[model samples]
Every structure is written in C-alpha cells, then in structure tokens.
Target chain A: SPGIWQLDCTHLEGKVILVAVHVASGYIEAEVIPAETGQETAYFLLKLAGRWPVKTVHTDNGSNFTSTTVKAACDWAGIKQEDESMNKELKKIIGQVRDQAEHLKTAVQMAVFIHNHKRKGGIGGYSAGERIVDIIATDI
Target chain B: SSPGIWQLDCTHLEGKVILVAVHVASGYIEAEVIPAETGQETAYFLLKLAGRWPVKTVHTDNGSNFTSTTVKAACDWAGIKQEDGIPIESMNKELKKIIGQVRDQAEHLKTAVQMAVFIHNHKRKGGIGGYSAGERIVDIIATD
Candidate 1:
C-alpha cells in the first residue's frame, strides 16, 4: 500500500513538507501545511483515494501521527491508523517490511519489478503479473 | 632372563639419591644405593649391573633415567623391559622397605637390611597400624 511522508518543522527551521508516491499505481497526493502543524499528514489522508482503501497506515508515534489534525483526517477518510509497536508480531512484520523497503529503496527499477511481479499469499506461487494474465485470459 | 625387582627410595632432601637393588630369581635383593644426581648416573649404575644379571625389566618412578635414552639403551642391550610405578599404591611395600633403609641410615648410622625389615614390621604405621607393609604383602598373597 502507498503511504504519505511528512516533515517535522518544530525543531527544523524550514517549513518544508515531503510527499511520497507509489510510482506503479500513479497515486498522486500532496500535503499542504508547515510540518509542525500536523496538517500535512491530515491533508495527505484527505487527498488519498478512499475507493482503493488503505488496509494499514504504519508510522512512528510522532506528532504527525498522534496529533488531532491527523487523527480527525484519518477518521474522516475512513482510514485506520497504526503506530509502530514493540509487540513481537508487529516487530517481525515491520522488520520484514523494512528489509523489503531497503531492497526496493535502492533502485526505482527494482521497486517496479517487485511491485509488478511479486505474488501475494493467496496467489499460489504465481507472480502478480501471472495472476493478472490468468484473470484476463479467463475473462476473454 | 629371569624377572627381577629393583627397589629405590627417592627423597628431595637427599638431593635425589636412588637406591637400586637387583632381586635375584632366588628372591634375595642384591641392592646398592647409587649417588645418582642425574639420569646419566642411573644409566651408568644399570650398565654396571648388566653382567651380574640378565635385565628383564627395570622399575622406577617417573624419573628422568627411567624414561631416558640411557635406560632404554641398557634395556635394548640386555633385551630387558622397563616398568614405572605411576600409581603409588602398587609399589607400597617396595617404597616402605626403601624408606626404612633411608630411615635407618638417618637415625642409627647403620644399613642393616634385617634390622630395617624387623623394625618396619614392628613399628611401621600402616593399615590402621595393625598390619605393616610386609604383613599386608603376606595377606595380599595369601588372599590371592
């Protein structure tokens, strides 16, 4: 799932905000406020499409995630928010995701390859590309 | 070559005096105390005894000579064997007899084997002071 990035301007001098996009899906979004106000994170949730519906939005338990602005935005968007926890299952999943993120973060081409070809748990050893091909052929 | 037993008494205070004796097949100990300051001296002593008896095995402590080239050579020359008493319990009687000889030399300025044996039997403290080393040897053989 695609998630948004926010900047912290309370300690930092510049009022810059950061936006991240999942290049494969072409999901476009922007956060529009000083990083310190938590408004940027809230705006990102509001801008994100509700039809696709984010299963989980994981973030550090910082002001951006915990603030009233972000919380209200998440509630209005019908999106559930999750803060990183030290719980074993959360830690394990986060570790795996982080390892995968490191691998993908290195190159855009590698990330695209993973996004296009990697299979899900329900896909019986077939890649996402293979599943799509199977579905299209069956439909035709 | 008949099997013979040599008894030796080694002490730290005496600067490593070794008493080596050849017990003939007739069961008499033809023994002498050799001033062996080194392993070489022990080898020389064994070499001197070469003609008197055909050496089968020489027994001693884990001494340098007992494990040295000289003793090995002597054994090789005489077609003899060498044995060492690593475990002290097996060599108890031989040690007592040697120590008794040393004690007599220290106390009475005498080297009488019969007197040492007699005194060792009567006054030696071993086996709850009831049986001396000689008495125990007797009992050990009787039981066997």
Candidate 2:
C-alpha cells in the first residue's frame, strides 16, 4: 500500500485552499479551488495523483470529503477514504499572508515550503524535504 | 550586488578529490569530480557554476588552488568577487555521506556526482526560511 496523507481544507476570505500533508515526510501540497463543491474537491484529488502515491486520504467529515464525487474519484484511482486538526497548523501557517487573496494562494505555497523545510525533532534533525529525498534515495 | 553568497571548497570522496560549491543562504550544494586538485581545475568549476547561477562573491579557503592567479583571473572575467575563509566543512561532510550512499547503492563516480548534486540542491534547508538553495536561486532570479 502507498503512504497515507492527511487532507483538509481552509477558507481564506471567500476562497478555499485544499491541502494535503504527507504523514511521513510532512511535505505539503496546497492549491486554491474554484469553489467549495464536491466536484472541485474531486478534481483536486485527481491532480494530486502525480505528486505522490495516495493509497488513502484521511480527511475530516466535511461535505466535500464525504461527497459521492470524491468517493467515486477515490475508487477510480484505487484509493480509500477515511475520517480524520491538522487544520490548526494550517490556519497558523497561512495566517502569515496578512493581506491579499492572490497572496493567500502564494501564501499557501510558501507555508508548505516553510513547513517542509523546518527541521523535524522526530526525524533525527532532518527537514521534511531532506527526509523525503533520503527516503527516495534509499527507497526503504 | 547579487542577493546570495556562494562558498567553495574541495573534499575527498571515493578516492577522488571533488570540488564543492555551496550557497550560504539556502544551503544548496554543487559538486563534481575534478580531474585534479589544481588551480586550473578549481577555476574551471567556479566559472561553470557561476555561469549557471548568479554568483556575486565566492569565499574559499587559503589553498593554492583557490588563491592562484589563474583562479583570480577566472573570477575577474566572470564578474565575481573572490574572498578567503570558507565555511563549507559541514557541507562537505554531508556531501560525502550522500556520495557514499550513491556509490554503495547507485552509480559510478560520474553519475554518482550528478545524483549527489541533485539531491543536495533539491533538498530543503532549515536555514533561509525553509527553502531549497535551488528554489532560492529561482526566487532570486525571478526577482531580477
């Protein structure tokens, strides 16, 4: 089975940003969606396929995460969906944006960049980015 | 002036003395197997790397290869400022650890050097606000 990802979404003013955090590496991928619809959420999942293997997505009991579109998308992608805070860190990180919506989009990106680059205490002092590369290098 | 500083040094790996370049801000590393540890070879590596990234200043140890007139001439031609006293000991140590892993499980020296360089540049550093050196370079370039 592939690794598990903690999925969640957050609202910035009127827009929403879908975020996925790799459990092992703590690497994140985030993007602003067009709308808070199931269809849009499913589309985001499909796009996430190429970034990393998604065996399962553990998300909150939100309507989008539980909608038929997301369920069907997961089934077609050969993945499983499950129920699952991660949002506090999300809000805290993206909160640094301070001003605009487009800046919020880049803020989401920069937030992930900062998260992955921070040294992890549990991972022997290596950053998420370093651990990710080491994982791929060793393939263990 | 360019927004970043690049430090230069050389280290022993797999029975070869390889040249190492590191961006102090992002902790990104560029390394390659030099034919010899001569002034000309060191100058070649510096100029090649400067061509790829914007290099404003380069700090190296007080070695003959780094201090020779040949290396000074190369830096001058490339519009790069040269200085002394490199802080690349930790980088060299980390680089060798990666190179050792590649040789044991991956490629020959030529391919091994490239892979090692790729991993070093792509991996995120905790310094410089958590961006990889390569990403920092891109941001620096984009700002320009």
Per-prediction DockQ: 0.00, 0.02
Task: List the candidate 2 regions with Cα displacement exceeding 4 Å.
Answer: A1-140, B125-130
| CA lDDT, candidate 2, residue A58 | 86
Tens-place lDDT per residue, model 2, B3-47, is: 557888888766788787777766667776767889777876775
**Candidate 1 per-residue lDDT over residues A1-140, each given as its tens digit:** 33332222212124432332332232212222455446556544543322122435655567667887677656645557664111232223324544432222222222323333444467356543344324322322
Candidate 2 structure quality by residue, lDDT tens digits, A1-140:
22688888777768888878777766566766667788767766754542344678888888987888777667755568898144566578668644422345545554655565567677458765555544443432
Q: For each candidate in the order shown, give its overall lDDT on alpha carbons.
A: 0.41, 0.66
User: What local lDDT score does residue A72 receive in model 2, on the 0 to 100 scale?
Assistant: 66
lDDT of 2 at B72: 86
TM-score of chain A of each: 0.40, 0.78
Indicate the worst ten consecutive residues by lDDT in candidate 1 chain A: A101-110
User: Once superposed on the true structure, which residue ranges of model 1 sit more than 4 Å away at CA?
Assistant: A1-140, B1-16, B22-27, B84-144
Model 2, TM vs. native: 0.47
- lDDT: which candidate is best? 2
